[PDB]
Design an enzyme around this catalytic site. Structure first.
Site, PDB file in Angstrom:
ATOM      1  N   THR A 212      -6.110   0.022  10.360  1.00 42.75           N
ATOM      2  CA  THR A 212      -5.849   0.898  11.509  1.00 42.75           C
ATOM      3  C   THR A 212      -5.900   0.173  12.855  1.00 42.75           C
ATOM      4  O   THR A 212      -6.682  -0.759  13.043  1.00 42.75           O
ATOM      5  CB  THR A 212      -6.785   2.134  11.551  1.00 42.75           C
ATOM      6  OG1 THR A 212      -8.104   1.729  11.940  1.00 42.75           O
ATOM      7  CG2 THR A 212      -6.836   2.820  10.192  1.00 42.75           C
TER       8      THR A 212
ATOM      9  N   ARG B 159       0.818  -1.206   0.000  1.00 45.14           N
ATOM     10  CA  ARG B 159       0.000   0.000   0.000  1.00 45.14           C
ATOM     11  C   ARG B 159       0.854   1.258   0.000  1.00 45.14           C
ATOM     12  O   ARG B 159       1.750   1.414   0.830  1.00 45.14           O
ATOM     13  CB  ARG B 159      -0.952   0.033   1.197  1.00 45.14           C
ATOM     14  CG  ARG B 159      -1.812   1.291   1.228  1.00 45.14           C
ATOM     15  CD  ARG B 159      -2.694   1.346   2.458  1.00 45.14           C
ATOM     16  NE  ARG B 159      -1.965   1.782   3.645  1.00 45.14           N
ATOM     17  CZ  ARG B 159      -2.155   2.950   4.253  1.00 45.14           C
ATOM     18  NH1 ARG B 159      -3.061   3.800   3.791  1.00 45.14           N
ATOM     19  NH2 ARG B 159      -1.445   3.263   5.327  1.00 45.14           N
TER      20      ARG B 159
ATOM     21  N   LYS C 158     -13.147   3.244   1.559  1.00 42.13           N
ATOM     22  CA  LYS C 158     -12.795   3.307   2.972  1.00 42.13           C
ATOM     23  C   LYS C 158     -13.899   3.978   3.780  1.00 42.13           C
ATOM     24  O   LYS C 158     -14.206   5.151   3.573  1.00 42.13           O
ATOM     25  CB  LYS C 158     -11.476   4.059   3.158  1.00 42.13           C
ATOM     26  CG  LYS C 158     -10.298   3.420   2.440  1.00 42.13           C
ATOM     27  CD  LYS C 158      -9.094   4.351   2.395  1.00 42.13           C
ATOM     28  CE  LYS C 158      -8.630   4.742   3.788  1.00 42.13           C
ATOM     29  NZ  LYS C 158      -7.463   5.669   3.740  1.00 42.13           N
TER      30      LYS C 158
ATOM     31  N   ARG D  25      -6.034  19.256   7.425  1.00 43.33           N
ATOM     32  CA  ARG D  25      -4.803  19.166   8.203  1.00 43.33           C
ATOM     33  C   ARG D  25      -4.345  20.535   8.692  1.00 43.33           C
ATOM     34  O   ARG D  25      -4.765  21.565   8.167  1.00 43.33           O
ATOM     35  CB  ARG D  25      -3.692  18.494   7.391  1.00 43.33           C
ATOM     36  CG  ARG D  25      -4.053  17.115   6.856  1.00 43.33           C
ATOM     37  CD  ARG D  25      -2.820  16.374   6.362  1.00 43.33           C
ATOM     38  NE  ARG D  25      -2.060  15.782   7.460  1.00 43.33           N
ATOM     39  CZ  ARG D  25      -2.018  14.478   7.719  1.00 43.33           C
ATOM     40  NH1 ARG D  25      -2.685  13.626   6.953  1.00 43.33           N
ATOM     41  NH2 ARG D  25      -1.302  14.026   8.740  1.00 43.33           N
TER      42      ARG D  25
HETATM   43  K   LIG Z   1      -4.475   8.209   2.697  1.00 40.10           K
END
Ligand SMILES: [K+]
Ligand SMILES: [K+]
Ligand SMILES: [K+]
Ligand SMILES: [K+]
Lengths: 500, 503, 499, 498
Positions: C298, C50, C240, C97
């Site tokens: 995760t 990944r 996701k 962010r």
């Molecule tokens: K990402």
């Protein structure tokens, strides 16, 4: 598996199981005496049928007297006493031809026959104009409608319908006498459900305290309710078994079943009305729906007819009787074999043997698991009892019942263990024979003031009966169904008790 | 969904939908040995023609066999509609027989009447009400006082009263009309006759030369009897199927070893009733059929089927009921005797048999059969067979198409008894004829030449099978079929299963 | 025989003798980029690499991809032992962010006061007083008491003043703040300008799958699908699920996607802790029912970032995800930036293999066989899995071109491994997404006779199965193929003895 | 219909309508010691109070027990709402601990040195280099290269040298070496002199159950049983599995125990982390199969010691233990010394209740059923069968010792088991069993048996209606004996809810 059950069938090993299917015997001149009746009861007779197609009320009243004399001669020992039900079989609506100046005048395959209704043309029937008592025959028959004469001997075929006469062609002829019986397949016969003579017989049945009535020629639900109405308030507790004898009865079977207490499958009469390649289907269908509905189904006619003259039945008869049991029939009924035959005692004994042998071919666990695949506290208790009877391999299921309903409820799930129905009501004890697997027991002891003492007394009595019958011995486990409080009219209590 | 519901939904007003899966075996005789009548019997549903070698000469049977094949091949021009017809040889075996009456009819025997049995050959053609001749010469030393003697399929029963050195005095227990050359049974006696007589050897050899498909071995009492029959047939008749007829108590007693040695079983209910009580015969029938179904070997129910149709054009309800229950028990084939051999309505008998068998199919609860036959059963070919039946239920397939040379792989599928018909496609005329012995197998004979490419040859035979299926109403456009083949040409075993849509 | 008895027979003292069936996905970073490390990770069980496109330039990622393929093809000399390795692109998505800090680490002190400016004059001089984040319309969709999370849900804040320019908060709790760290607000474009560039870069680099971040509805998936276009139509889109809205509209997201990734860590930010395990179980369940791959990601083995072995709680959490029915397990920082990336992969392999001992295969299939929605291929799939149990087969061999037929078999969850034989390199790599599929790449040239070419591929599968210890000589295997060259069905089943 | 459908139907926006079937065990300490706090913990769902005898004096624990009973009996005025609360004694057992810190905590960083001493003059001063422990036999069971863990596996050490009355180690993993911390060494007696005194104290204080630490074999359990003796024969003994030998010899321990506690943390030190989950699932399965209570303990909601809410992983860990088949969940430091003891109990209640939606109840039963000529067992099975068949709101069991309620509980019905008793001890002990809702009947015994049965059943009816288990019109299953004072609970009654 059912397959494995068939593979290990052994003709050289005796039947270890008890007979669970009831035996109904037609009582007549050959079995009317107290001494013969005593032996028949000992041989396995559970119900005595009276054919009211013939005989006077005086004759039948004497027969009922003899049956009860023979039955009560065993009352000196309540543990071994077996209740015996009395059944009244109605004459029913018939279709009869006129008098051929009796004698006979033959017909042939091709000639014509002009059916009439002239109520004075009775005394002289030709090979042409034929008479019958069916007044309204011309509005339930069509063109091409077959007309069987004398138990499927002479078939006709309607060609012209006036307004009160018919022109017919003779399909296949032969001999034809006086007052013969005609069948109209597959017409919707409009004759009354209860003839004036039936109203007399049913009235007589109420005074004689009969346990059940076999209602002949039922075609619809309204026929059943007509018999019910005649029996009235006084005969409200008399069980009504509808006899399915024609095509309309088979087609309208569901409404008849829902209106009846039980069903009798009359194969012989069925065989006249519908082709032979379909009768077995109708039998299996009707038995299946009765089993599903938890209502008694009786298989009658053409069981062991050869035993009228022989001490031994043919293997075909034995096979036919056996397959009726395996189909799921609750009772098997004998006719001329016990009514007028030369070997009435052998017939009852043979029926017992065949029923016992067929028991080995029964796959008990499957029937229950299917009848369970198909709210009320009593229903759950009944299912739970049968489930527990398989789990504990119980010798019996003991049901304390007043009317019999609680026992019938358990019986509909077809447990392997015999159902010992304990009652103080003599009628429900007799009527219990209609249900497969129910072994009715009649308690004579007075009621104890302490309810738990009265229950324990009835249970211990059932315990003694079970030991005597060999259903179970000490150390075994039985399932006991009772109520909870004195006179709370619903069985919701299950008890798993060791045999003391 | 349940067996109970299945019974409850039975409707007599509904026309029988599914096809007839059980074989029909007809005894050929004076009433049915003509080419004309044989054609009508094949049309009406005859799958196997039985030759009764208890009567007739070899030239008589050669003529019957020729007539059967003439009638059969008259339909051969349309291979899509062509139905293979098998020929069965039914041996005489260790028979005891009367006894010619005067100079061609019958005499009457009445209850309680004295009857003398003799071995004097001077009476072999002058039998009557008083004296009776039979061909078993050692009868006096196998029988006792009080012994029961049954004549003509148990129609007449006698009881020995006096044993002479060369004769017997009897009293008629069950009366009736005695004819000529009728069979005799001695229930409690130990008959000394061999399983395979010299006449039987001649007959079996004749069967090999005439290229019969199967042999019905009479009066089999043990495994060694079957091995003797197998031995006589030898290498030349190694592919001829052997069906052992269970006709007595010892046959039932030693059924397991007879079944293992045989290719199939015939349950003779009538003969069984002689030695076994009436309240036990039905148990024996169900037992033997069950073990045959378990072993995956064809079982035939014979005798006392539609006997009343010998004189009437319609059977009784009891007969139809008895026929249906044999099918429901799990019988692969039903055999007719006098109904087709000598009766007045042989055409009507075959048609009625077809009618009863088809109606009986409606009462069969297919899924339980398979689910039990898979759980309690003893190979890539076997796993493929199970999987094919699995898929046939799962996909509600119109058929299972099996490409077979010997018939073996089709037989293995038949053991599990799928609801869908099994179309066995073969180029071998013999296995096509023998396939009728198995329930649910619809044999089909491909006469098309072998295509050069194997996959092309498979598609040709499958296309042929689908045309047959459509014509017979098994399935239609849009349905799905299961196809069993081997992988690559010259493949030893059928281990390939294909799910193909019907175009 | 029963599930309970299966649990009772578990033995920690017996070696896990079954093969590992769940795919291992590793995030590649500075700790695992090298060809040497990648080679060892592949040997240790890495199935998918990944690439996190939240950081790094295209130049950097092109080099990483090149290294992955260099390491992968270094084993290509032995086709029987060669393991295909897939490449996954993980988009940045609608991330919010923070900004850089003047000088660099500061402590967001518990109980302090922060000021979220949207003005690009503090984007490089952040501190304990004023903070900058790249989200504009933040004062258009929020109340005056909401919560804001920093550093992947680590730090929490309490907004108590608005307007339009800024936001005044209060530190409920915190710790350390780096620079440009993740911000969570428990309507940015689903596919941004940067995402489009990364996605088109993915098509150019011939990646096998895309992990689409922050999918909230079906139209988000359709947009990603649109961007990939005709050139990237064969690229798998794994959506996701990271927030509550993704859970609510999961059914339409699943139908539109090729697969699903369950991001538990992000899920816990919005959804209460007492509910996340339910959401995980639900989503994995619906993915198994639909026959679509589901990846658990995760908070897997995070402790292995600095330690050579995980805690028992981490081992249990990973094992339960596998037991829930997950097709693949994804590692993040453990392999990307951690001190023990190789040990992390090996431990992941160890846990997943031990967890297989607790898998009760028959029940999974029986329920799926009963729940599943006339197709010859689908019927053959069921029959093959059913025959694998009945014959106790060592493997189900599936000759497949696109992988679809092998996927249909995998849906029914046979205990026996599924050896998918293909000549298509991409299908071999993408097959790792499906539990129980052991993809195998045939490199032998196409035989002239179709039947002979089928035998060659089956024989190749036989040799792989023997070398892997799936089965041996005399055993029985199931073989699924087409019937003729160019067949549109995988409808032919064979029960064949192992040569 | 299918477990898969059951999973697909899980919905996080749907409130848990069902009640909590798993018991909650709370460790009582300085944070939960007061009567006031205990009252709130009982209302929040605490069923059992655990007393950790690894620390504290008898009188300290004697006051805790008094406080727990004061808090419990404060609700006694309402028999219908009253919830029994059990008291559990957790023995110290064969544990080894460190000495005292000079100062207080000293820092042990990764890659350092440490002197483990038997110098009793340094059991007051354990600093950056020196440390004292209370295991004299330490230099007889540890080699060179042996590993030593301290304070729940926080700090690990490497043995380089083997001195006389000391050890020379190498700090492999860092941490903060506190005081009085536990030390693991992957021959101390099963029950020590201290344990003998503590168990005697337990009998005197009328505790309901004993958590026996570090059980390795069957003979360990019977040693505890013998100390409890005749006077403490009705005290439940739950064996704690804390090491590899306990797992290996699990069957003999289970067959000697009344119940089992799985200590994951202690298991984690001894057994590889990739095997503990297997061990947990095996032990829970065998306990379920045997019908014996199993407690999942240690490392449950540890983060709630300092935080008002748990992490995602802890919620999944607790939930999976419930779904594994655990009867009870035990909280340690979260309730003993943490800053949020009340929140810990409530969160445990919430997680347990939420996990309940993921249980396919009919599957457990149908397996257990096929996995007896005994009437009581047949009645127990039949009652569960009927509860599914009737969709009963509850199964009411009239019991004296609790045994009858226990065998119904083994089959895991969906419906709550209302165990009606006059014995207050069995009411408390019944909390160890999943699905059992014990009620203490205080009405005096009626002269007529059928009347006294009806009194107890009606009491259960009112409890069920108050708790929302069922309402008027519903149907419940009732299990009783047949005559006054009988051997078998062999009577099953299907009765409508008035
Ligand atoms: K990402
Ligand atoms: K009558
Ligand atoms: K013959
Ligand atoms: K302790």
């Amino acid at each position: 598996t059912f397959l494995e059950h068939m593979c290990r069938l052994d003709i050289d090993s005796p039947p270890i199981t008890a007979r669970n299917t009831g035996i109904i015997c037609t009582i007549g001149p050959a079995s009317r005496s107290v001494e013969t009746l005593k032996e028949m009861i000992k041989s396995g007779m559970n119900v005595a049928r009276l054919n009211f197609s013939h005989g006077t009320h005086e004759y039948h009243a004497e027969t009922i007297k003899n049956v009860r004399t023979a039955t009560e001669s065993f009352a000196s020992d309540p543990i071994l006493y077996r209740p015996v039900a009395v059944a009244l079989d109605t004459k029913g609506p018939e279709i009869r031809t006129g008098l051929i100046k009796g004698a006979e005048v033959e017909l042939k395959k091709g000639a014509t026959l002009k059916i009439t209704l002239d109520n004075a043309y009775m005394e002289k029937c030709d090979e042409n104009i034929l008479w019958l008592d069916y007044k309204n025959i011309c509005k339930v028959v069509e063109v091409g409608s077959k007309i069987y004469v004398d138990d499927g001997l002479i078939s006709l075929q309607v060609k012209q319908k006036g307004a009160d006469f018919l022109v017919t062609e003779v399909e296949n002829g032969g001999s034809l006498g006086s007052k013969k019986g005609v069948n109209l397949p597959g017409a919707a016969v409009d004759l009354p459900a209860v003839s004036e003579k039936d109203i007399q017989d049913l009235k007589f049945g109420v005074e004689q305290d009969v346990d059940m009535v076999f209602a002949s020629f039922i075609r619809k639900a309204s026929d059943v309710h007509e018999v019910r109405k005649v029996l009235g308030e006084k005969g409200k507790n008399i069980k009504i078994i509808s006899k399915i004898e024609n095509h309309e009865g088979v087609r309208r079977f569901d409404e008849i079943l829902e209106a009846s207490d039980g069903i009798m499958v009359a194969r012989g009469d069925l065989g006249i009305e519908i082709p032979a390649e379909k009768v077995f289907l109708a039998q299996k269908m009707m038995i299946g729906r009765c089993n599903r509905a938890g209502k008694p189904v009786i298989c009658a006619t053409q069981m062991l007819e050869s035993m009228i003259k022989k001490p031994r039945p043919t293997r075909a008869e034995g096979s036919d009787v056996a397959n009726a049991v395996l189909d799921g029939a609750d009772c098997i009924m004998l006719s001329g074999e016990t009514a007028k035959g030369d070997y009435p005692l052998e017939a009852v004994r043979m029926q017992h043997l065949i029923a016992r042998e067929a028991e080995a071919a029964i796959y008990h666990l499957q029937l229950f698991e299917e009848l369970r695949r198909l709210s009320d506290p009593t229903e759950a208790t009944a299912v739970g009892a049968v489930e527990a009877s398989f789990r504990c391999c119980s010798g019996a299921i003991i049901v304390l019942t007043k009317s019999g309903r609680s026992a019938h409820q358990v019986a509909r799930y077809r447990p392997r263990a015999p159902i010992i129905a304990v009652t103080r009501n003599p009628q429900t004890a007799r009527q219990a024979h209609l249900y497969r697997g129910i072994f009715p027991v009649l308690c004579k002891d007075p009621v104890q003031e302490a309810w738990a003492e009265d229950v324990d007394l009835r249970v211990n009595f059932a315990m003694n009966v079970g030991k005597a019958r060999g259903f179970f011995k000490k150390g075994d486990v039985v399932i006991v169904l009772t109520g909870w409080r004195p006179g709370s009219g619903f069985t919701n209590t299950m008890r798993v008790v060791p045999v003391p």
